[PDB]
């Protein structure tokens, strides 16, 4: 690995993400954006499902 090496021979950092889902509940999920809360008004609420 040298500065003058060809692009094919230049170093490349490789990061592979693999996602495995077995017969078990899933822990790693995406973020769940939440809206602001309003009091003293008739609203349709959803708290933790």
């Amino acid at each position: 690995f040298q500065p003058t090496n060809g692009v094919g021979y230049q170093p490349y950092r490789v990061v592979v993400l693999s996602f495995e889902l077995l017969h078990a509940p899933a822990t790693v999920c995406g973020p769940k954006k939440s809206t602001n809360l309003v009091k003293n008004k008739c609203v349709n609420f959803n708290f933790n499902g």
């Binding site: 077995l22 017969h23 078990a24 509940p25 822990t27």
Partner: peptide, 22 residues
């Protein structure tokens, strides 16, 4: 092949362990 990992007389320590749908 791991599928999980978590890290955090005088005493009566009672415990109840159970499994429901995994």
């Amino acid at each position: 092949n791991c599928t999980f990992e978590y890290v955090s007389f005088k005493n009566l320590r009672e415990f109840v362990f159970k499994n429901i749908d995994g």
